[PDB]
Amino acid sequence: HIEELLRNIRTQVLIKLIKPYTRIHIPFISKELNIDVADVESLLVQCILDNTIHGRIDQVNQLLELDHQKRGGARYTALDKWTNQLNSLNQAVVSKLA
Amino acid sequence: ATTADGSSILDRAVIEHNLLSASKLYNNITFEELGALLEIPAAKAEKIASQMITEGRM
Amino acid sequence: KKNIQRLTKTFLTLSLQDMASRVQLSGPQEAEKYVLHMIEDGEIFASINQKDGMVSFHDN
Amino acid sequence: VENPSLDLEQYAASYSGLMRIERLQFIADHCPTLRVEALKMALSFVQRTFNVDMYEEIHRKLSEATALDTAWVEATRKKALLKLEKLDTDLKNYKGNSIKESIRRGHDDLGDHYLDCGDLSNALKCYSRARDYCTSAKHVINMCLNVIKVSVYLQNWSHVLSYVSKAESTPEIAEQRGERDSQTQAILTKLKCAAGLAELAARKYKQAAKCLLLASFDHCDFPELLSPSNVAIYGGLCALATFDRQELQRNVISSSSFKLFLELEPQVRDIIFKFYESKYASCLKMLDEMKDNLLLDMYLAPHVRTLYTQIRNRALIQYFSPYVSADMHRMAAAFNTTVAALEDELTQLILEGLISARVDSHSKILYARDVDQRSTTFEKSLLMGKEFQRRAKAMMLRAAVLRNQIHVK
């Protein structure tokens, strides 16, 4: 069970470390966690796939971009719904009976 | 006493206070200017700034 | 033109020879001419870099 | 084929029917100097009760590929018909004098001698006649099991599914608590395995894996409907093909009953673990190696190849889930393919909307695409308004022409 450990603690440290950043170098994370870059990339991929870290990885520049975005634009989504509804209703008036 | 890296408790406390006070007069700052404002240019200015965040203090 | 637009729906930066092969236009110069005509007409949003014979899509 | 011949227990009790004959013949029709009596062993030396007529046909074929019993065939076939007449007489005497136990036995062993002597239609009609033998819920379970077992041979799955549903729903939802698994044997496992087999045969993989996964390992004492290794093959491959990450983690990874099944074959367990833990090159290599042995069995042949493609597609999506800008060289290297083939696959995937990305064929980089919500909303609302205005201006003319009553006389 020592393999399950030394991974939960690393995950918690990573989560508490990448919290305030928005675009953070991966070599910096590797230096902080005292592991090689491949392990850092694998851990980040596993965490993102598990919905524990909200961010993406820029592989070309070796960067991690966080999710300080997606503001309260849900209003637009609501409008979208209305749009399609209206479309259907239009047909229901243009082919109701004649 | 010294908090590990040869820094007195008063020095660390006043550095944290200076960072907190400068957070009220700056929209955004650079690491070099933040270090020039309160010494410790970049080795631990970013570290202190990130430590103040994730704790509700900034 | 429809095939070229569908190409823009997927790619971001494409070689002229690659575009000619995909749209079966049989020639990079002919593909460049078609893209230039469509850009002039406004049906497409693209730019041509002749240094590498490349076409980029700026859909904003 | 690099490391073959590591399978011996299969030849003992793999399957039952002509399907094993066809599949084993297909192996040796290709491999050098293998179509011989050694191959013919598992085909024809398994000849059993009434295996004389299809013996005649595929034995004429083997003869042509690689004598004709008519003395022993006449003797034992007409011996079997003699028992047909004489048994039929005995069971019909039990029918006439109305010994319910003996009449139901008549049904059962007559179906037995029908699968023992070629008859299948009258066997199915007797399985339906089992209705007359209305003892209790136990007899209902018994006849449902028999009809499922025979309809598996009969190449029908709609009736199999209907019988499975009616058997699961008739005794008040599997006797509610199950009557402590009836007689300390859970009949639920048999019905669940049969339902999963039928559902996968019906080109419905996800529904098959939903019910096939929950099967008790200790209650698989019927090695004639579906072998446990085949059960693990199905519940691994189909579940990997259909289930998403959370479903795979919940119903497979954390499930304890399926673990023993995964112990039957390390290959499926390794495939699942490698797919789960972001290891795709080795997973694809092992799948390619296992593809031949998987296609060996035809009960999964109309299902395997397509499923493989699906799995690959899923892998692709996963590889781009945590990345905002991926390098296609590493992607191609990790997917055991060249850059051009990966580019074509990604273009095909993007064209159908599975993955939102853009290919840059200058540095060969796959960038992520973010949709602008406000701009898209405005554009689609304007399009809807234009369409509505056009429809209105058409309908007004339609109404005007209806008022005048214009038509060609």
mmCIF file of N, CA and C in Angstrom, chain D residues 314-367:
data_model
loop_
_atom_site.group_PDB
_atom_site.id
_atom_site.type_symbol
_atom_site.label_atom_id
_atom_site.label_comp_id
_atom_site.label_asym_id
_atom_site.label_seq_id
_atom_site.Cartn_x
_atom_site.Cartn_y
_atom_site.Cartn_z
ATOM 1 N N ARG D 314 -12.007 6.218 -29.051
ATOM 2 C CA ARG D 314 -12.066 6.655 -27.663
ATOM 3 C C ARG D 314 -10.688 7.080 -27.185
ATOM 4 N N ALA D 315 -9.679 6.243 -27.443
ATOM 5 C CA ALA D 315 -8.320 6.570 -27.033
ATOM 6 C C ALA D 315 -7.924 7.942 -27.552
ATOM 7 N N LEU D 316 -8.186 8.196 -28.839
ATOM 8 C CA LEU D 316 -7.837 9.483 -29.426
ATOM 9 C C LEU D 316 -8.407 10.618 -28.590
ATOM 10 N N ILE D 317 -9.707 10.546 -28.290
ATOM 11 C CA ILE D 317 -10.349 11.617 -27.537
ATOM 12 C C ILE D 317 -9.658 11.794 -26.196
ATOM 13 N N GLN D 318 -9.379 10.680 -25.515
ATOM 14 C CA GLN D 318 -8.739 10.772 -24.210
ATOM 15 C C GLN D 318 -7.384 11.450 -24.327
ATOM 16 N N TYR D 319 -6.628 11.125 -25.379
ATOM 17 C CA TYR D 319 -5.306 11.712 -25.533
ATOM 18 C C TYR D 319 -5.372 13.223 -25.680
ATOM 19 N N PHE D 320 -6.496 13.763 -26.143
ATOM 20 C CA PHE D 320 -6.632 15.203 -26.282
ATOM 21 C C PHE D 320 -7.464 15.828 -25.173
ATOM 22 N N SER D 321 -7.906 15.043 -24.192
ATOM 23 C CA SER D 321 -8.711 15.615 -23.115
ATOM 24 C C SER D 321 -7.947 16.631 -22.271
ATOM 25 N N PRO D 322 -6.740 16.357 -21.774
ATOM 26 C CA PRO D 322 -6.052 17.333 -20.918
ATOM 27 C C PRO D 322 -5.094 18.274 -21.635
ATOM 28 N N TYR D 323 -5.078 18.307 -22.964
ATOM 29 C CA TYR D 323 -4.102 19.085 -23.712
ATOM 30 C C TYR D 323 -4.777 20.231 -24.453
ATOM 31 N N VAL D 324 -4.140 21.401 -24.411
ATOM 32 C CA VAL D 324 -4.587 22.550 -25.192
ATOM 33 C C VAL D 324 -3.756 22.737 -26.457
ATOM 34 N N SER D 325 -2.564 22.139 -26.530
ATOM 35 C CA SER D 325 -1.738 22.214 -27.734
ATOM 36 C C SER D 325 -0.823 20.992 -27.724
ATOM 37 N N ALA D 326 -1.180 19.980 -28.508
ATOM 38 C CA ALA D 326 -0.445 18.727 -28.544
ATOM 39 C C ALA D 326 0.464 18.670 -29.765
ATOM 40 N N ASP D 327 1.580 17.965 -29.615
ATOM 41 C CA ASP D 327 2.517 17.748 -30.710
ATOM 42 C C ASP D 327 2.168 16.433 -31.395
ATOM 43 N N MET D 328 1.875 16.497 -32.695
ATOM 44 C CA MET D 328 1.373 15.316 -33.389
ATOM 45 C C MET D 328 2.448 14.262 -33.614
ATOM 46 N N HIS D 329 3.729 14.627 -33.539
ATOM 47 C CA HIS D 329 4.782 13.621 -33.651
ATOM 48 C C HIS D 329 4.730 12.645 -32.481
ATOM 49 N N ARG D 330 4.637 13.171 -31.257
ATOM 50 C CA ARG D 330 4.524 12.309 -30.086
ATOM 51 C C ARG D 330 3.222 11.520 -30.107
ATOM 52 N N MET D 331 2.138 12.143 -30.575
ATOM 53 C CA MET D 331 0.860 11.446 -30.683
ATOM 54 C C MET D 331 0.966 10.257 -31.632
ATOM 55 N N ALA D 332 1.578 10.470 -32.799
ATOM 56 C CA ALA D 332 1.747 9.388 -33.761
ATOM 57 C C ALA D 332 2.657 8.298 -33.211
ATOM 58 N N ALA D 333 3.732 8.687 -32.522
ATOM 59 C CA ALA D 333 4.628 7.697 -31.935
ATOM 60 C C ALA D 333 3.916 6.866 -30.876
ATOM 61 N N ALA D 334 3.066 7.501 -30.068
ATOM 62 C CA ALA D 334 2.352 6.795 -29.012
ATOM 63 C C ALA D 334 1.160 6.004 -29.528
ATOM 64 N N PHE D 335 0.685 6.287 -30.739
ATOM 65 C CA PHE D 335 -0.427 5.547 -31.317
ATOM 66 C C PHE D 335 0.011 4.539 -32.372
ATOM 67 N N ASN D 336 1.313 4.255 -32.466
ATOM 68 C CA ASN D 336 1.848 3.251 -33.389
ATOM 69 C C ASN D 336 1.425 3.538 -34.829
ATOM 70 N N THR D 337 1.615 4.784 -35.253
ATOM 71 C CA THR D 337 1.219 5.199 -36.591
ATOM 72 C C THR D 337 2.100 6.356 -37.036
ATOM 73 N N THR D 338 2.048 6.647 -38.333
ATOM 74 C CA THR D 338 2.796 7.762 -38.886
ATOM 75 C C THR D 338 2.032 9.069 -38.682
ATOM 76 N N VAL D 339 2.680 10.174 -39.053
ATOM 77 C CA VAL D 339 2.069 11.487 -38.875
ATOM 78 C C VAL D 339 0.908 11.680 -39.843
ATOM 79 N N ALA D 340 1.054 11.209 -41.085
ATOM 80 C CA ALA D 340 0.010 11.419 -42.086
ATOM 81 C C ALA D 340 -1.264 10.654 -41.743
ATOM 82 N N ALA D 341 -1.131 9.398 -41.311
ATOM 83 C CA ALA D 341 -2.309 8.619 -40.943
ATOM 84 C C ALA D 341 -3.014 9.226 -39.738
ATOM 85 N N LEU D 342 -2.243 9.684 -38.750
ATOM 86 C CA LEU D 342 -2.837 10.352 -37.598
ATOM 87 C C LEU D 342 -3.535 11.640 -38.014
ATOM 88 N N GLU D 343 -2.944 12.377 -38.955
ATOM 89 C CA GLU D 343 -3.575 13.592 -39.460
ATOM 90 C C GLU D 343 -4.908 13.282 -40.125
ATOM 91 N N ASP D 344 -4.946 12.235 -40.952
ATOM 92 C CA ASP D 344 -6.197 11.852 -41.602
ATOM 93 C C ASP D 344 -7.242 11.421 -40.579
ATOM 94 N N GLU D 345 -6.830 10.636 -39.579
ATOM 95 C CA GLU D 345 -7.765 10.196 -38.547
ATOM 96 C C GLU D 345 -8.318 11.380 -37.763
ATOM 97 N N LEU D 346 -7.454 12.329 -37.402
ATOM 98 C CA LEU D 346 -7.904 13.505 -36.668
ATOM 99 C C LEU D 346 -8.832 14.364 -37.513
ATOM 100 N N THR D 347 -8.538 14.503 -38.808
ATOM 101 C CA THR D 347 -9.425 15.258 -39.688
ATOM 102 C C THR D 347 -10.796 14.602 -39.772
ATOM 103 N N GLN D 348 -10.829 13.274 -39.906
ATOM 104 C CA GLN D 348 -12.104 12.568 -39.948
ATOM 105 C C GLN D 348 -12.870 12.733 -38.640
ATOM 106 N N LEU D 349 -12.167 12.664 -37.507
ATOM 107 C CA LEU D 349 -12.828 12.822 -36.215
ATOM 108 C C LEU D 349 -13.375 14.234 -36.036
ATOM 109 N N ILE D 350 -12.614 15.246 -36.454
ATOM 110 C CA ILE D 350 -13.053 16.628 -36.296
ATOM 111 C C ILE D 350 -14.237 16.924 -37.208
ATOM 112 N N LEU D 351 -14.233 16.360 -38.421
ATOM 113 C CA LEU D 351 -15.308 16.640 -39.367
ATOM 114 C C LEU D 351 -16.666 16.191 -38.839
ATOM 115 N N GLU D 352 -16.699 15.154 -38.003
ATOM 116 C CA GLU D 352 -17.945 14.655 -37.439
ATOM 117 C C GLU D 352 -18.228 15.208 -36.048
ATOM 118 N N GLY D 353 -17.399 16.126 -35.557
ATOM 119 C CA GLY D 353 -17.669 16.804 -34.306
ATOM 120 C C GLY D 353 -17.307 16.042 -33.052
ATOM 121 N N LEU D 354 -16.643 14.890 -33.175
ATOM 122 C CA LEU D 354 -16.278 14.120 -31.989
ATOM 123 C C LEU D 354 -15.287 14.880 -31.114
ATOM 124 N N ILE D 355 -14.289 15.511 -31.727
ATOM 125 C CA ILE D 355 -13.243 16.229 -31.007
ATOM 126 C C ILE D 355 -13.125 17.628 -31.594
ATOM 127 N N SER D 356 -13.095 18.635 -30.723
ATOM 128 C CA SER D 356 -12.982 20.031 -31.142
ATOM 129 C C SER D 356 -11.507 20.416 -31.142
ATOM 130 N N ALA D 357 -10.904 20.444 -32.327
ATOM 131 C CA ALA D 357 -9.485 20.748 -32.455
ATOM 132 C C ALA D 357 -9.211 21.219 -33.874
ATOM 133 N N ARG D 358 -8.034 21.809 -34.060
ATOM 134 C CA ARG D 358 -7.584 22.289 -35.357
ATOM 135 C C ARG D 358 -6.162 21.811 -35.610
ATOM 136 N N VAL D 359 -5.907 21.343 -36.827
ATOM 137 C CA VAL D 359 -4.614 20.785 -37.202
ATOM 138 C C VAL D 359 -3.789 21.869 -37.877
ATOM 139 N N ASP D 360 -2.543 22.027 -37.438
ATOM 140 C CA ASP D 360 -1.593 22.958 -38.031
ATOM 141 C C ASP D 360 -0.514 22.118 -38.702
ATOM 142 N N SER D 361 -0.584 22.026 -40.028
ATOM 143 C CA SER D 361 0.370 21.238 -40.809
ATOM 144 C C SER D 361 1.542 22.087 -41.287
ATOM 145 N N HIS D 362 2.112 22.856 -40.365
ATOM 146 C CA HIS D 362 3.375 23.551 -40.574
ATOM 147 C C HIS D 362 4.424 23.098 -39.575
ATOM 148 N N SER D 363 4.074 23.072 -38.291
ATOM 149 C CA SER D 363 4.862 22.408 -37.264
ATOM 150 C C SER D 363 4.196 21.124 -36.789
ATOM 151 N N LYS D 364 3.102 20.718 -37.437
ATOM 152 C CA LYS D 364 2.361 19.503 -37.098
ATOM 153 C C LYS D 364 1.896 19.531 -35.642
ATOM 154 N N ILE D 365 1.018 20.486 -35.340
ATOM 155 C CA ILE D 365 0.547 20.702 -33.975
ATOM 156 C C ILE D 365 -0.976 20.699 -33.965
ATOM 157 N N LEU D 366 -1.563 19.970 -33.021
ATOM 158 C CA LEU D 366 -3.010 19.933 -32.847
ATOM 159 C C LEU D 366 -3.388 20.922 -31.750
ATOM 160 N N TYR D 367 -4.024 22.022 -32.137
ATOM 161 C CA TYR D 367 -4.460 23.041 -31.196
ATOM 162 C C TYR D 367 -5.900 22.792 -30.773
#
